[PDB]
Symmetry: C4
Subunit: 364 residues, 4 copies
């Protein structure tokens, strides 16, 4: 029955209108400065970068989405085999459903069978830490796919509007997560799920030892929309309230700025509405180490292996065109390339006390 949410989630995400619904990444307020003399040739552009103890071919990852039933595993299988082929890391979807039901397990393990070398990232929700999950459940999530890291997701907005949601985010959870991390052999990433990570939340997680963040800002998949749709579907009164919250959250671009600023040494995934290699380039230039994507990977995967391969080919070409046209021979140069910040993003940073001088120095 958690298993039908799982398919309903994928079905609404894949086929309903929830991508950027009434929301914004603020990435239109970021401009990469064009260099008419790049100083490089396209063919010498190098996109390799570090992902924990592995090297990856591109600074992009697929973030966690699904798992829990065999048709969901077939999607994970297509994503994982193509991610392997391209040398990109892949997070799986929440593994709760496979801690609760042994028959859900293969729909996650298939990822590692088909992708033996790339970084694979486990996944469990914060609310499960408040309800009993502890070290052993983390280790089971991890071994089930021989993960190189585990992502713990924050989705309080989703849970608030979810018909059968669990909006429990007591501080005790962080004490538990900090303890669990002492004992785990792989790092923890804390990621949002469409509503973004602010500086208050990043400093707080940081105070409990978390150094790896995934912004998942607003502007991309709108989980408040997804749950609004599930509410409409059951005639649940919450739907009209969800609609008032459609634009709730920290935009992706602002979240990247807030996390890089407030935790200058964090390992940062910039995600939530990254739809092109140009978006990916902007995310990294603003301050992320890697760009994350979920929804468009799902939509291509459902179309098939070849559609997904073409999708990555296009993302990668678009990333390298942005590096070419900013004179960035490598990911490190991209992180330092010249930008312009305009509009609401600029007003957001100013109000929030993001001194642009210190900002430029910190993103580099």
């Amino acid at each position: 029955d958690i298993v039908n949410r799982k398919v309903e989630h994928v079905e609404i995400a894949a086929f309903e209108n929830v991508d950027g619904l009434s929301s914004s990444t603020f990435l239109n307020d970021v401009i990469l400065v064009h260099q008419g003399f790049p100083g490089i040739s396209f063919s010498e552009i190098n996109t390799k970068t570090k992902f924990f103890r592995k090297e990856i071919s591109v600074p992009v990852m697929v973030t966690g989405m699904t798992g829990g039933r065999n048709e969901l595993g077939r999607i994970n299988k297509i994503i994982a085999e193509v991610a392997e082929k391209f040398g990109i890391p892949m997070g799986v979807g929440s593994q709760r459903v496979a801690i609760e039901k042994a028959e859900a397990r293969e729909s996650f393990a298939i990822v590692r069978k088909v992708a033996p070398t790339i970084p694979i990232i486990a996944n469990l929700g914060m609310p499960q830490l408040v309800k009993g999950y502890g070290l052993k459940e983390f280790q089971d999530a991890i071994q089930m796919i021989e993960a190189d890291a585990i992502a713990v997701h924050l989705n309080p907005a989703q849970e608030v509007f979810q018909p059968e949601g669990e909006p429990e985010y007591q501080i005790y959870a962080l004490e538990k997560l900090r303890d669990i991390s002492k004992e785990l052999s792989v790092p923890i990433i804390v990621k949002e799920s469409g509503n973004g990570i602010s500086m208050e939340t990043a400093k707080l997680l940081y105070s409990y030892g978390i150094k790896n963040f995934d912004t998942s800002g607003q502007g991309g998949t709108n989980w408040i929309a997804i749950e609004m749709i599930r509410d409409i579907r059951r005639g649940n009164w919450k739907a009209e309230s969800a609609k008032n919250f459609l634009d709730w959250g920290v935009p992706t671009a602002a979240s990247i700025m807030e996390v890089r600023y407030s935790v200058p040494d964090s390992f940062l995934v910039g995600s939530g509405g990254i739809r092109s290699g140009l978006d990916a380039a902007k995310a990294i230039a603003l301050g992320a180490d890697i760009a994350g994507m979920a929804l468009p990977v799902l939509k291509s995967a459902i179309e098939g292996k070849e559609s997904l391969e073409q999708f990555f080919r296009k993302i990668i070409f678009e990333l390298k065109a942005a590096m070419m046209l900013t004179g960035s021979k490598d990911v490190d140069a991209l992180k330092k390339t010249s930008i312009v910040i305009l509009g609401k993003l600029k007003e957001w940073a100013e109000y929030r006390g993001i001194n642009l001088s210190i900002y430029e120095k910190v993103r580099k």
Copy 2:
């Protein structure tokens, strides 16, 4: 005949297009910062707060609207009994009509019969203070409903365009109000009626002893539109002039800032176009002690008791979602939560000498 006006007011506000007509709250310029780790659980959120010497369940009030005839009293009955059920304060409409006609009295008194515990707020207009009302009339308004406070409304814009209107706001009235307040056993609130309270107005009222304010800013019920409609209806020439004034006034959000800034210890109702618990959260976060609402309460009340009950359930849920998602365990924490101010509201504050640093400290 003032009784026909009372009827025509309700009918135009309920059924014509005057909610936010050519006007704006500026609340879209206020963003509540999302906290992906709230640090609390939904179920522990506490919405109680003080309203003078009483405790109320939710920091929201229904502000004054109607009374004067038995159908108007049936509306007041429904609002009051639901307000009583939910532990929320209720203002009644202008009681002038019941000072002038004894047969109008029961349409107000019904409120206290059906709501014996909640704060009830009496109502008289400023222009009646310059025309002979004094202490006794205030006391009669109060005792008629065993009121816990009396609201004196400012409606000069309305009066100017009213067919019918009395635009008399001589300073003598304030002298009289200050004198009356010496003798009254309950507090006075001064409220606008759709065009908002500016800093010069709030400082002037304060200089005469007024400490309780209700912004009633523009962007909600447009009273200049309502009178425009009454002018059209009678082929009165003033209609075309009212139309040029549709966007006149201080936007709610700016008014909240101006009042809180210029009278930092004021008790503040933030109202005028509050249409969701999210709007209510923003109002409180910006500087108000409570959020006030009138028009959407009227619309639900007209549909009936159950519709009105559902409306409050939804407002309260939305308020709590916004507290949850900012990590606000209680009203006091919401007042201090992180915000961003952008766009025209930012420009309005800057031009008016609202130093944002000092604003932050003052709102807390």
Copy 3:
């Protein structure tokens, strides 16, 4: 034939779409701060003010438009008799046509027959000063209507696009104007004609003794558009060029700021797209001494005396509404009332070095 262009000007201005065509006054960036406690009564509001040596009932004037043929004089007759009834000053149209043709004279003189007490303002164009006009022609313009002042118009944008235009604006014209002003027994006002007065132009005129200005900024009657239509009509190639210039000039609001700032002691008419008594209030609050209007007066005058009477009644009502609602018992108080400046006007002032503190003090 000059007589024909005068006919054609009125016809295009009255009947074609040239009011505010692709242009803006920037008055939407000026907000008058609402005072919910005005401290006054509508009936005590005083709108009297000084116009040179006379008193006028309202701080509004009708600016120069027409004259030159008998049907044009019938329009001047109607405007003048209504202006007399209301105690408002009236400028006449360029009197060149009546210096050149004695039969054109009565169409100006009728103004003074019918309006024996109000200020009447004569009119000649700056280009004529470089083409032979001097003292005697000014004195002839003045005595023809026993004028209390003479306006000299600037219209270089119009003359550039006019099929038979004279774009001659040699500095010698100012030397001549300065000399003439020594000898004249009435004051000179220099007025633009839909393209506005900048600070450089105001300071230059001031250096030659000019102390009285009429901004005639962009956003109201678009004279470039008028000449563009005349060019289309004659298949003149210039029409396409005029179209690129439709939005050329200083917006009225900016021009009022520029002139009041750069010449703090000037006598200032704020005009160019004043369409309501609210616009008129904003213009005075921004820095003008009086609001000027031309096109809407022509349109009403063409419809008849009673239409024109109704029009002034509405402007006056709207002006007094705005004074009531800002707590302005008189014109002097309106000049000092609180405002907000936002948007492009704000950015215009900042780029042009208009320090807002010193601005606030100067407008007063």
Copy 4:
């Protein structure tokens, strides 16, 4: 092969929708301040200016476009003979095609036969410098048309999306350019091609001795769009990627500021979406020495000699109208005339560290 590309470029530029496609010059953020007293007469305005060792009649040039086949030469012939008649300089299109194929030569030489006195500017692409071209090729391009200068184009964005493009911009190319310039008897201009010159690029070029720049900013011909169209036509996958890059580049107005700022003594052509004499005047007032145009000259030339004569007549009239209306007797006075800069261009300059005070002094 390349001859076919040359024909398809002209056809797509002339007849498809690529002029300003999803892009912007930012010239709408530049306002020339109107001067109601210009202090000059239209007939005394002088538009002459220097272009290296020649005098040209108007501060406008036609920038390089075509050549390579006899129908392309017939367009070159028409533009050249009209340019000659008007005293305006003309660049030819890339001469690569005529270095590779001797039959393409006459389509360039024709320009000098028909325009013996005006400056003619040769053209080669920067990629060819890394691919074997050097002094001799430059000298051939120059003698082929007895050029007064040679433009070297930057088009890395075009090359990236061009189906058969060569994105090779190694620093060695600049080393070679600098060496060539020692030996050449005419100056070098470095020009972009629709995507604009940033300060980092201008400083880098300057460091290798280049002092002559042509902004060719985004907002006019969109070469990324043109190549997108060629990719669509060939079902080449890159088209979808080009589409994501449609708004890539430095807007013309921003590029003019960046170059004039970071290289104050540069000789500077402002181009990329100059469509009227008004645009031309803005470009010069902002900091360019001359305004450049390509696409609208092509579309006129294709209609014929008389159409192109009419086009120039219009551009020059518009330019002079803008001088007239700013009080600019000559090109030098235009470069110093008062402007306002607003909106995104203002935010762009602030973010990029362009101090407006120092900007003003340098643009003069």
